[PDB]
Enzyme design. Structure first.
Site, PDB file in Angstrom:
ATOM      1  N   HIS A  41     -30.201  89.836  16.277  1.00  0.00           N
ATOM      2  CA  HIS A  41     -30.658  88.758  17.149  1.00  0.00           C
ATOM      3  C   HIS A  41     -30.595  87.383  16.483  1.00  0.00           C
ATOM      4  CE1 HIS A  41     -34.613  89.501  15.109  1.00  0.00           C
ATOM      5  NE2 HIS A  41     -34.717  88.193  15.263  1.00  0.00           N
ATOM      6  N   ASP A  85     -30.669  96.555  15.687  1.00  0.00           N
ATOM      7  CA  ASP A  85     -30.809  95.132  15.389  1.00  0.00           C
ATOM      8  C   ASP A  85     -30.354  94.889  13.948  1.00  0.00           C
ATOM      9  OD1 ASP A  85     -31.399  92.484  15.719  1.00  0.00           O
ATOM     10  OD2 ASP A  85     -33.579  92.715  15.712  1.00  0.00           O
ATOM     11  N   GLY A 174     -39.027  83.105  11.517  1.00  0.00           N
ATOM     12  CA  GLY A 174     -38.312  82.665  10.340  1.00  0.00           C
ATOM     13  C   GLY A 174     -38.022  83.771   9.355  1.00  0.00           C
ATOM     14  N   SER A 176     -36.955  86.946  10.255  1.00  0.00           N
ATOM     15  CA  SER A 176     -36.021  87.942  10.781  1.00  0.00           C
ATOM     16  C   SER A 176     -34.812  88.117   9.876  1.00  0.00           C
ATOM     17  CB  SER A 176     -35.541  87.542  12.171  1.00  0.00           C
ATOM     18  OG  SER A 176     -36.369  88.115  13.158  1.00  0.00           O
ATOM     19  N   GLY A 177     -34.379  89.367   9.729  1.00  0.00           N
ATOM     20  CA  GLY A 177     -33.261  89.683   8.868  1.00  0.00           C
ATOM     21  C   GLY A 177     -33.609  89.793   7.405  1.00  0.00           C
TER      22      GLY A 177
END
Lengths: 222, 53, 42, 13
Positions: A41, A85, A174, A176-177
């Site tokens: 995402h 994801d 902030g 994410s990933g």
């Protein structure tokens, strides 16, 4: 990252910052000199990757910057359900490794038993502030069953959830990933979780990295 | 009807810069979008936000 | 520190990465997969 | 025989 604290300067050599138009968009994990793993995402044209960073406000002699030459979203990613994801980003040239830039081994075994983990990132803190210095927090994996009970009908085998019932340490906007690290392996990526951020009531949901071993290898040697 | 909904960050943990129509200001304003879910008071540009609201 | 290093995993039958602290440990510890595999791969 | 030894992060980790 809510209810965490600042990391030690040498303890996150695998953390990447993904930028768009000069601002933090997500975290990422260096898993190979040429490839950064992040959440699907987070996809965005013309991403910029910063490696070796600790304090986003200061230009640091250890940092390296690169454009993304290939973004590989998982083919089965379902934005509506957050399933699968995960995204790979190829850098423009291999990263130069140091004590502050270094890839992290992936968790290959979905049966790995380590439950003590930690998360890190530059996302929103408990105050709602976006910090310049990267934040760290220790959290623990939660059972697949307690995960399902928290988000009925939403947890797939491609997801992992983790949190802290004492203080609610959790990822936020902030992060994410970024990496969920258990036993010095990449166990998960920050994906989604409770609104508001905080894991006292429901854990955060992470992409289950051990499921993408083969997909990651075949992407990297393509 | 859409333009009076609150700005929704959503469940995902990204940091997208989006636009929403603020009723009290009567203009469009930035907000942090998490990258998934939310509502449709959520526009990529300030121009497009005002073209609709 | 946290170095990306390689070791031979007997249950995988091939070399695999691990995090090395920079000092001590043992000799099942290689800076590349290729070097690991030339010492341990057959 | 060195190939059968456990991976050791060592004491600087």
């Amino acid at each position: 990252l809510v209810h965490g604290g600042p990391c030690d300067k040498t303890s996150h050599p695998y953390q990447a910052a993904l930028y768009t138009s000069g601002h933090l968009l997500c975290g990422g994990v260096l898993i190979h000199p040429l490839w950064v793993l992040t959440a699907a995402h987070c996809k965005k044209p013309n991403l910029q990757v910063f490696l070796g960073k600790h304090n986003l406000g200061q230009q640091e002699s250890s940092q390296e910057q690169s454009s993304v030459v290939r973004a590989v979203i998982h083919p089965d990613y379902d934005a509506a359900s957050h399933d699968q994801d995960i995204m790979l980003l190829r850098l423009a040239r291999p990263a130069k490794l140091s004590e502050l830039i270094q890839p992290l081994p992936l968790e290959r075994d979905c049966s790995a038993q380590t439950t003590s983990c930690h998360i890190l990132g530059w996302g929103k803190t408990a105050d709602g502030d976006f910090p310049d210095t990267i934040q760290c927090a220790y959290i623990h994996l939660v059972s697949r069953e307690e995960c399902e009970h928290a988000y009925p009908g939403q947890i797939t085998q491609n997801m992992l959830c983790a949190g802290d019932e004492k203080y609610g340490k959790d990822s936020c906007q902030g992060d994410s990933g970024g990496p969920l690290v258990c036993g010095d392996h990449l166990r998960g990526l920050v994906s989604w979780g409770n609104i508001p951020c905080g894991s006292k009531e429901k854990p955060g949901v992470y992409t289950n990295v051990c499921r993408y071993t083969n997909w990651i290898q075949k992407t990297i040697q393509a | 009807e859409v333009c009076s909904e609150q700005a929704e960050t959503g469940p995902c943990r990204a940091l997208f810069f989006r636009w929403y129509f603020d009723v009290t200001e009567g203009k469009c304003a930035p907000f942090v979008y998490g990258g998934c879910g939310g509502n449709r008071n959520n526009f990529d540009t300030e121009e497009y936000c005002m073209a609709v609201c | 520190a946290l170095f990306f290093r390689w070791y031979f995993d007997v249950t995988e039958g091939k070399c695999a990465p691990f995090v090395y602290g920079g000092c001590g440990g043992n000799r099942n510890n290689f800076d590349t997969e290729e070097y690991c595999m030339a010492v341990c791969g057959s | 025989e060195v190939c059968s030894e456990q991976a050791e992060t060592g004491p600087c980790r």
